[PDB]
Design a protein around this ligand. Structure first.
Ligand SMILES: Nc1ncnc2c1ncn2[C@@H]1O[C@H](COP(=O)(O)OP(=O)(O)O)[C@@H](O)[C@H]1O
Ligand SMILES: [Mn+2]
Length: 428
C-alpha cells in the first residue's frame, strides 16, 4: 500500500530473498505497480535472477545474462538519480540487504523513505539488522556455537592453534585489506589455501569460492551484504576502519575499532544457515560499539542526497533511524548543474571517494584538471614504500603525490594507491 514503508527484518536465512521477495514481485505485477528491486552488489543481483527466475523483471546490470519490475544495484539507482537520466517514480521500492552502509545505499534509503513520507510511494527494506539493532546474536536456521576469543590481527607462530587445527572451511572478517594480506600470507605458509575478498575485487574473486578448493576466505566488511558461503566457521575480529573527517579538511581511516551490533550479527549470520547442519561456530575477537556515529559514509550520503532532485527546492532527508549519525546542514552540499556533473564524474569515472570528489567539484575544478593532486601541503604527501609517491603528470613532469585535499582511502592499500596515481597522472 502507498505511504507504507515496511521493514522486513526476519532473522538471517529466514527466506527474505529467496521466498518472500518472489511473492512480493508477483503481487506487484498483479497490482501493476511500477517496482524497483535494489540489490547490494552485482554478485547478489545474479543470485536474485535465480530466485526470481520466470518472472518478468528487467535486469539493469550486465551481471545477469538474460517488464514493469526493474532490478538494479543500490549504487546504480543513486547514480541514475544524480545524473540527467530519467528514473521512474517507482510506486514500490524494494531494497534488499538494506543494512548496507555504502554512501549510495544510505542515500537511496533517504530518497526512498522521503518519497514514502510525501505519500508518493511504498517501500520495503529487507534486512535482518535494521538501523539501531542492538542484538549481535540473532536467531539462525541452526544453532551457532558462539565463543569470545583473542583473534590474531597480525602474523602469528604460537598461541592460536585453534585457528589452524580446524578441518572445515572458515570465513574470517579482518579489519583492513592490509591486515588481511598479512593473515593470508601467514595461513598460506601454514599450508592453508586462502582466498582474499575486498570491495574492489569481490565479483572476480568471489567466484573462486565456488571454483577452487579453499580453507579460508579472508574478507573485509563487503561480505556482510548477501555473500553466501559453504563454510562451517566464521572468525570475526569484530574490528573495522572508520573513515572520519578531521577538522573539516581531511579524511583519516581511524581505528581499527569495534563494529556495530548489526555488522557483527551480519558477519556471524554467514553461518548457521543450514537447518540440517548444526554445529557451525562463530569466534569473535572483541565487543561491539555504535561506530557508525560520525562515520564519513553518512556525511557522504548527505552530499549525494543534497544533489538529487526531489521536488522544486526540497531535499530528501536521511532515513529517520540513521539520520542522527551525521551532523550536517540540509542542502549545504547542493551543487549547481555543472559542478554537480563534475562531482558525479569524479565519483564514477574518477573512482574517487564521495567526500574527496565533493571537495574538488565544489572548488570549481573541472574533471580532467589534476593540478590539485600535486599542490597540497607537505603534510599531505602520500607515501609508497616509506618514500614519497611519485607519478609523471600528463605534462611529462615527475612530481610528488601531494593532493590539496587528503583522503586516506585513496592510498589505504596497494591497489587504491595504484588507482590514485593513475588518476593524478591523467590516465582516466
Ligand atoms: N542457491 C541456493 N540453493 C538452495 N538454498 C539456498 C540457496 N541460496 C541460499 N539458500 C538457502 O535458502 C535459505 C533462505 O535464504 P535467503 O532467502 O537468502 O535468507 P535471508 O534473505 O532471509 O537471509 C537459507 O537457508 C539459505 O542458506
Ligand atoms: Mn537476503
Amino acid at each position: 500500500k502507498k505511504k507504507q514503508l515496511t521493514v522486513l527484518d526476519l532473522h538471517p536465512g529466514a527466506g527474505k530473498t529467496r521466498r518472500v521477495l518472489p511473492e512480493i514481485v508477483r503481487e506487484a505485477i498483479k497490482k501493476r505497480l511500477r517496482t524497483v528491486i535494489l540489490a547490494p552488489t552485482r554478485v547478489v543481483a545474479a543470485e536474485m535472477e535465480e530466485a526470481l527466475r520466470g518472472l518478468p523483471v528487467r535486469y539493469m546490470t550486465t551481471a545477469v545474462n538474460v517488464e514493469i519490475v526493474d532490478l538494479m544495484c543500490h549504487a546504480t539507482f543513486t547514480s541514475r538519480l544524480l545524473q540527467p537520466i530519467r528514473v521512474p517514480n517507482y510506486n514500490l521500492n524494494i531494497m534488499d540487504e538494506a543494512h548496507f552502509t555504502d554512501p549510495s545505499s544510505i542515500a537511496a534509503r533517504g530518497y526512498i523513505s522521503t518519497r514514502v513520507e510525501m505519500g508518493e510511494a511504498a517501500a520495503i527494506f529487507m534486512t535482518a539488522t535494521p538501523p539501531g539493532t542492538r542484538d549481535a546474536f540473532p536467531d539462525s536456521n541452526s544453532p551457532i556455537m558462539d565463543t569470545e576469543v583473542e583473534v590474531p590481527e597480525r602474523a602469528w607462530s604460537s598461541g592460536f592453534d585453534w585457528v589452524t587445527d580446524h578441518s572445515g572451511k572458515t570465513v574470517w572478517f579482518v579489519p583492513s585489506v592490509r591486515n588481511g594480506n598479512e593473515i593470508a600470507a601467514c595461513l598460506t605458509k601454514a599450508g592453508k589455501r586462502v582466498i582474499q575478498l575486498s570491495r574492489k575485487t569481490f565479483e572476480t574473486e568471489f567466484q573462486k569460492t565456488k571454483n577452487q578448493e579453499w580453507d579460508f576466505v579472508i574478507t573485509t566488511d563487503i561480505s556482510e551484504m548477501g555473500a553466501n558461503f559453504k563454510a562451517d566457521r566464521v572468525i570475526d575480529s569484530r574490528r573495522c576502519l572508520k573513515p572520519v573527517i578531521l577538522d573539516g579538511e581531511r579524511v583519516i581511516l581511524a581505528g581499527p575499532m569495534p563494529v556495530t551490533h548489526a555488522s557483527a550479527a551480519q558477519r556471524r549470520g554467514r553461518i548457521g544457515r543450514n537447518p540440517n547442519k548444526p554445529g557451525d561456530e562463530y569466534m569473535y575477537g572483541g565487543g561491539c560499539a555504535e561506530t557508525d556515529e560520525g562515520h564519513a559514509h553518512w556525511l557522504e550520503a548527505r552530499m549525494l542526497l543534497d544533489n538529487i532532485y526531489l521536488q522544486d527546492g526540497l531535499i530528501a532527508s536521511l532515513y529517520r533511524p540513521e539520520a542522527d549519525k551525521v551532523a550536517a546542514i540540509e542542502g549545504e552540499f547542493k551543487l549547481r548543474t555543472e559542478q554537480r556533473k563534475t562531482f558525479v564524474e569524479l565519483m564514477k569515472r574518477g573512482d574517487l571517494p564521495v567526500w574527496l570528489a565533493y571537495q574538488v567539484a565544489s572548488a570549481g575544478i573541472t574533471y580532467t584538471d589534476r593540478r590539485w593532486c600535486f599542490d597540497g601541503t607537505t603534510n599531505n604527501t602520500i607515501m609508497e614504500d616509506s618514500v614519497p609517491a611519485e607519478v609523471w603528470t600528463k605534462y611529462g613532469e615527475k612530481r610528488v603525490l601531494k593532493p590539496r585535499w587528503m583522503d586516506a582511502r585513496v592510498c589505504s592499500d596497494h591497489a587504491a594507491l595504484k588507482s590514485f596515481k593513475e588518476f593524478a597522472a591523467g590516465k582516466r
